[PDB]
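Exercise 7. Predict the joint structure of the components listed below.
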Amino acid sequence: KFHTVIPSPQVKCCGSLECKASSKADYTCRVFGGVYPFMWGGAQCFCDSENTQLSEAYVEFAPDCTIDHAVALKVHTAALKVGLRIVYGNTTAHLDTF
Amino acid sequence: PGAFGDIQASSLYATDIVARTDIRLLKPSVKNIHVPYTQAVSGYEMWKNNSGRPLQETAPFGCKIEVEPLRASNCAYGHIPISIDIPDAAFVRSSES
Amino acid sequence: PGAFGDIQASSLYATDIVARTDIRLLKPSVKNIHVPYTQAVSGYEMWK
Amino acid sequence: SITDDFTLTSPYLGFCPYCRHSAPCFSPIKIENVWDESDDGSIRIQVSAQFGYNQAGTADVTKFRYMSYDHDHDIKEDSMEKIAISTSGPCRRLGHKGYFLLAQCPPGDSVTVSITSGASENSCTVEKKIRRKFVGREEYLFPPVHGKLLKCHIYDHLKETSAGYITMHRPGPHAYKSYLKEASGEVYIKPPSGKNVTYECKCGDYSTGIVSTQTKMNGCTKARQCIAYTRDQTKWVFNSPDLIRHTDHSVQGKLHIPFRLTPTVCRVPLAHTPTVTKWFKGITLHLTATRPTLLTTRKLGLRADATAEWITGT
Amino acid sequence: PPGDSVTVSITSGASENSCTVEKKIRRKFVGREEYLFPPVHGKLLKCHIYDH
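Solution:
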């Protein structure tokens, strides 16, 4: 299972921001035109409609993935190995052969 | 996206994770700071719901499927041409018996 | 077992009750004192 | 490296989609993540408040620190008997450390974290499907006394165990409208008593500075075109989607995620032994199941026609 | 919350009592999508509510 990591939004919010390239898994970015974002405390910057917000979203491994995960395998020709119990005369021999 | 293997990595502790989970970033509507997003369901979870029964229960010839290493134990199929070179001392003279 | 009449008596106040409910007594697996058992469903309730 | 010094970290305010009044609001107990991969029904919840620590950040099991609604940007401490988790009914608290709570919750369609009394009484409900989980091929409500022992993975009740880490970043700017006066036709910068506050204004020209007292600024007719936030802020906050990042958004430190998913042994029911009636080339199984029990068959030849069915009743 | 009955109770005092009636209360949503509680991000439609 993936953990959608959304970082804290960046607002160079009197001016403009540019989408970059990152190696994080499924790194999605988007630049939004005029925002004027609010928090507990009112207006977060000064210019009215010259405000740009950058949305980032990539994907991680969930913390519980070290236990609940799957492994993808390719398996080639199989080999047979047997344990034999040859009893000849009054002597018993145990042995493994390919 | 939405199928098994939508997120892949060589190991769990790897820094080269590759993923494709269909993340669409939406234009914020509310005044409060927000990152509205939408995503496809976890392919791992979808496969877990639609995995079917394992090889431990769908195996032929009464095979016991075991892991670490992967093996199919105690399979009843076919014939094995064994060739034994019995030591000479085991045989006894026809006079002794 | 599991059908109507798995417990039968000539009267409700009888000392000669006869039954067959498939009581299976299991081996105690825990350290504390226990009588593990499993039983078939009540035939009377099934018929109801 | 991963630190446990919570004096260097601070709680924050999030945007809860469902507060006490059933409306979105800024809350100190916002629910960030909910994890349910435990085979005994427990869940791990991440919150914007820090549990088990006092105001100063030193460990104190009976107290939790949260973000005040005040204009002075302070951190408040309250007792942990006021922390209540509910999913459909009340949930049992099994542990707490930092942003993380562990609870045993009945199945339900939502998760709630509340402060049940005091000044900071609120809630936070998020939509999560918490579903009943059972181990094995037999259904049960609570584990039986008699059964066989399998391998099940559960969340450790101890907070020292670590299941990963979370990245802690520098606190971003937090503009407060209380710091602007707008006296007559020109704006004034009013700090929260003697604390340094930095201003960013667009009164024709970009101007910035730090101030300890009242300031007239220059040519700002409206208070809309300037913002002010406290400079003292240096304690790290979580990488939350509800905060505005600093210009240096690098991973400054790391915190643990407690309650590791460890392997243990569970108690699982043993079903009623089937009654087998034998006929020519076949068997009949008389199966008594009070809860859904899985019957799986297969042939031991080349064809392995495999029946799987969940059986309830006789 | 949804349910089959409605109860009005006097939880304390001399006149502690109750009254229960059979009324079907079911979950209600607006639009073509099911939700448990309204989301932060969405589209604003016309819904009719009881003025508090």
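Discussion. Chain B has two helices and six strands.
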